[PDB]
Amino acid sequence: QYKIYPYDSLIVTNRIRVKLPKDVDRTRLERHLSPEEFQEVFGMSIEEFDRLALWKRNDLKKKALLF
């Protein structure tokens, strides 16, 4: 559905090093990050995300330096 981009480059914390590409969204960047990376960068299991709601996925994303 989307293009699996690198978390190291996707992380806003690297905004100083490099900026995000053009073929990437900012509203739902979660879909641009692999499942193993999302659960590895967040801490919980990938299953938790799917079980959680959007509002939650968004909040956690920002905390993970995704937004």
Coordinates of C-alpha atoms in Angstrom, one line a residue, residues 8-67:
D8 CA 16.7 6.2 10.7
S9 CA 15.8 8.6 7.9
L10 CA 12.1 8.8 8.6
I11 CA 12.7 9.9 12.2
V12 CA 12.1 13.7 12.4
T13 CA 15.1 13.8 14.8
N14 CA 17.3 13.5 11.7
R15 CA 15.5 16.5 10.1
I16 CA 18.8 18.3 10.4
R17 CA 20.8 15.5 8.6
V18 CA 18.2 14.8 5.9
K19 CA 14.6 15.7 5.0
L20 CA 11.9 13.2 4.1
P21 CA 11.3 12.3 0.5
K22 CA 8.4 13.4 -1.7
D23 CA 6.7 10.0 -2.0
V24 CA 5.9 9.9 1.7
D25 CA 3.0 11.0 3.8
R26 CA 3.1 12.8 7.2
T27 CA -0.4 12.0 8.4
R28 CA 0.0 8.2 8.4
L29 CA 3.7 7.6 8.3
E30 CA 3.1 4.4 10.3
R31 CA 2.1 2.6 7.1
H32 CA 5.5 3.7 5.7
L33 CA 7.3 1.9 8.5
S34 CA 7.7 -1.9 8.6
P35 CA 5.9 -3.9 11.4
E36 CA 9.1 -5.1 13.1
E37 CA 10.4 -1.5 13.1
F38 CA 7.2 0.0 14.5
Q39 CA 7.1 -2.5 17.4
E40 CA 10.9 -2.2 17.8
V41 CA 10.9 1.6 17.8
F42 CA 7.8 1.8 20.0
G43 CA 8.6 -1.0 22.5
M44 CA 5.3 -3.0 22.4
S45 CA 4.3 -5.7 20.0
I46 CA 3.0 -5.0 16.5
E47 CA -0.2 -6.7 17.5
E48 CA -0.8 -4.1 20.2
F49 CA -0.9 -1.4 17.5
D50 CA -3.5 -3.1 15.4
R51 CA -5.5 -3.7 18.5
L52 CA -5.1 -0.1 19.5
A53 CA -6.9 2.9 18.0
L54 CA -5.7 5.6 15.6
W55 CA -5.5 8.3 18.3
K56 CA -3.1 5.9 20.2
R57 CA -1.0 5.0 17.1
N58 CA -0.6 8.8 16.4
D59 CA 0.4 9.7 19.9
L60 CA 3.0 6.8 20.1
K61 CA 4.3 7.8 16.7
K62 CA 5.1 11.4 17.7
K63 CA 6.8 10.0 20.9
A64 CA 8.9 7.7 18.6
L65 CA 10.1 10.7 16.7
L66 CA 8.0 9.8 13.7
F67 CA 6.1 13.1 13.4

